[PDB]
Design a protein around this ligand. Structure first.
Ligand SMILES: *C(=N)[C@H](C[C@@H]1CCNC1=O)NC(=O)[C@H](CC(C)C)NC(=O)c1ccc(-c2ccc3c(cnn3C)c2)cc1
Ligand SMILES: *C(=N)[C@H](C[C@@H]1CCNC1=O)NC(=O)[C@H](CC(C)C)NC(=O)c1ccc(-c2ccc3c(cnn3C)c2)cc1
Lengths: 305, 305
């Protein structure tokens, strides 16, 4: 029993982190086989940052200008190229700790673990959701760019995120490992808007099923609703619309608890318009939306990797 | 910017986990040098669990009754002994992945990371505090016993917790790595009380300093207080008394923000008796007490390992 925000074990990803330095700028790189991936803004000086011309900046760079360190060992850079917003540095040595891996572009609402690093060294791990507005609520300081987000499926690491920047609202933005930003963001020092930060409705419902499974049932009411009725109410509170696919994704948790999905929707509806009246659910006084239905099933089932 | 509950990178501990089986009972063991540590209740059957006589149970066991598996490899058990509530299995092979380590008995209020495991395989990592009543709020299912809690200092792993049991209130109890329980608990299937679950006051204040540092300042008020005045109010809300040592531990965060510790106490006092009026602090609608002052400093400073 109990329910916690839980990250994947980070060992397979720790062995892929290196330090990448151009001039005075140092950030993190991901070393997989014989390539190191890192944010392209490693090549900016503080003065290029308002509106950098990355093509013109990169053209002044040679292989030997990139210093790549794995521990106290320098990797020899034998080629470099830009792919969208990431730099790929070809090195003469394949990482002996490369895990089985693939690159994935995740969907809004899906979760992943972040290994926050500085100077190529891990600082900690935490779990994030890709928000509907394609930001994440992370913890990142100067020097954290190139830290990556990932999921693990048994023995295979799915890399889905590399960190690039902070928005004025204090949330975070970055790219997939092909260097394409999530959302409408660009890698320059300008104020950029993410737009309305809507709540991942299917995830809140999964978390409410987790609550029932772990003994918190006070919020279950005597009503049901319809998908259209529920969505008319939830969108007034900036909740994402619930689709029939979402209803079926919740099916196994519904079956496991004996609470119909639309009954849970009616309980969520009442929570939204009446609040929690000073009470808590799984130790929270807000509705939590960063657990997926698969996260809930895995945690309540003890899936291992 | 941003502030998250963050676990230590788990790679050094992942390489120490093994599976330990007696009869039909399988749990996790920690393999360090040539010893495997695990909860002694691996030797119980479901029928011994109400009031087990561990001395009499262990006496019927021989080395070859313990099956220890690291991956698909069996470790040869060449000796066994009971130390308080943990079993120590001597094996004929030293773990080649043993990190630098030590065993530590932590203090109430201190935090650590848990690597939750099943069948010797990691399932995830999360951060916990040792509560004042010597429980933890974890996420543990059948088969999770032997999962460990730890801190990392640069390159040294400090093991502080091994998981044994759940209480009726849904919180969790376990031992240090010398097998001595935290708190008044015993490893049998009886209803056991942990007593009043009081709030770690110094940690709430650290988290409020984290909030100021990360831009949430709405709760700062125009008052100050005294240590005695503050403690008279906080203990009515089941908060731990704040000592002058605690005040000095908060000193660097106070210096970094320019908010005197007793001014922050007066802001906490008003939060306790007036609530948060529907507002949030660092994304929470409750006062969070599972960040230590050192946790806050490390995270706001980017300390790496
Ligand atoms: C990578 N190492 C950092 C990670 C940042 C540092 C602080 N927290 C993080 O997550 N990445 C950078 O420093 C980025 C580099 C550029 C080239 C992409 N830049 C930013 O993250 C960044 C920060 C702040 C602003 C900003 C511009 C204008 C603003 C405000 C607020 N008001 N205005 C008018 C913020 C832009 C870019
Ligand atoms: C280790 N693999 C498990 C971990 C437990 C399983 C569920 N969640 C956990 O953290 N450890 C055990 O199963 C323990 C084995 C004994 C020998 C220590 N036992 C328990 O964890 C346990 C669970 C429940 C109770 C209990 C007894 C009496 C009760 C209640 C509630 N009301 N009453 C009257 C609970 C005792 C021990």
């Amino acid at each position: 029993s109990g329910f916690r925000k839980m990250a994947f074990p980070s060992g397979k990803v720790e062995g892929c982190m290196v330090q990448v330095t151009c001039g005075t700028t140092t950030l993190n790189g991901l070393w997989l086989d014989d390539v190191v991936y890192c944010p392209r803004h490693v090549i900016c000086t503080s003065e290029d940052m308002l509106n950098p011309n990355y093509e013109d900046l990169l053209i002044r760079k040679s292989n030997h200008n990139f210093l790549v360190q794995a521990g106290n060992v320098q990797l020899r850079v034998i080629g470099h190229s830009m792919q969208n917003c990431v730099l790929k540095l070809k090195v003469d040595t394949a990482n002996p700790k490369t895990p089985k891996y693939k690159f994935v572009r995740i969907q809004p609402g899906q979760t992943f673990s972040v290994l926050a690093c500085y100077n190529g060294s891990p600082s900690g791990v935490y779990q994030c959701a890709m928000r509907p507005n394609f930001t994440i609520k992370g913890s990142f300081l100067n020097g954290s760019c190139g830290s990556v987000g990932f999921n693990i499926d048994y023995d295979c690491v799915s890399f889905c995120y590399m960190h690039h920047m902070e928005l004025p609202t204090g949330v975070h933005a970055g790219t997939d490992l092909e260097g394409n930003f999530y959302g409408p963001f660009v890698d320059r020092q300008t104020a950029q808007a993410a737009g309305t930060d809507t709540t991942i409705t299917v995830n809140v419902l999964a978390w409410l099923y987790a609550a029932v499974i772990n003994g918190d049932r006070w919020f279950l009411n005597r009503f049901t609703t319809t998908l259209n009725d529920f969505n008319l109410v939830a969108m007034k509170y900036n909740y994402e619309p619930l689709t029939q696919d979402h209803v079926d994704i919740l099916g196994p948790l519904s079956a496991q608890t004996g609470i119909a999905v639309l009954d849970m929707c009616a309980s969520l509806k009442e929570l939204l318009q009446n609040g929690m009246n000073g009470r808590t659910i799984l130790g929270s006084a807000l509705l939590e939306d960063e657990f997926t239905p698969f996260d809930v099933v895995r945690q309540c089932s003890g899936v291992t990797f």
